[PDB]
Design a protein around this ligand. Structure first.
Ligand SMILES: *C(=O)CCCCCCCCCCCCC
Length: 131
């Protein structure tokens, strides 16, 4: 509800320090912070999620199950929020890919706990029919 954008020169230093490709020289720029904040608005997702380490990671979860059938737009976001999430969790990524393989390790910390509960609560299969 405040002035446009939230990050500043300080954070911009790290945001621009991240490379877009694994073996390339391209990096992230404001162009993305704007495109993302806007994209989410179209994905029924509020841009106010980029202002929280827990908010970003959460966003990825929504597209996680959509990665199988996600357009070029959804795919971008996933790779985007993944780069920002590290910016708020105090993580230095070498590139887009590096970030992914990075956040995946952070989830394992919670998976170990979710398993203790899964032993009691489990999911079932799905199936429908049409004439
Ligand atoms: C008030 O209406 C709250 C919403 C304003 C916050 C939007 C700022 C988005 C922050 C950009 C994230 C940086 C992407 C790397």
């Amino acid at each position: 509800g405040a002035r446009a954008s939230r990050l500043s020169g300080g954070e911009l230093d790290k945001w621009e320090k991240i490379r877009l490709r694994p073996g390339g020289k391209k990096q992230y720029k404001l162009k993305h912070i704007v495109w993302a904040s806007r994209e989410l608005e179209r994905f029924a997702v509020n841009p106010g999620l980029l202002e929280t380490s827990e908010g970003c990671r959460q966003i990825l979860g929504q597209l996680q199950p959509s990665l199988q059938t996600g357009s070029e737009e959804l795919r971008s976001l996933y790779n985007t929020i993944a780069v920002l999430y590290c910016v708020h969790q105090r993580i230095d990524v070498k590139d887009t890919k590096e970030a992914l393989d990075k956040i995946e390790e952070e989830q394992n910390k919670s998976k170990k706990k979710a398993q203790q509960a899964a032993a009691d609560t489990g999911n079932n299969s799905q199936v429908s029919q049409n004439y």
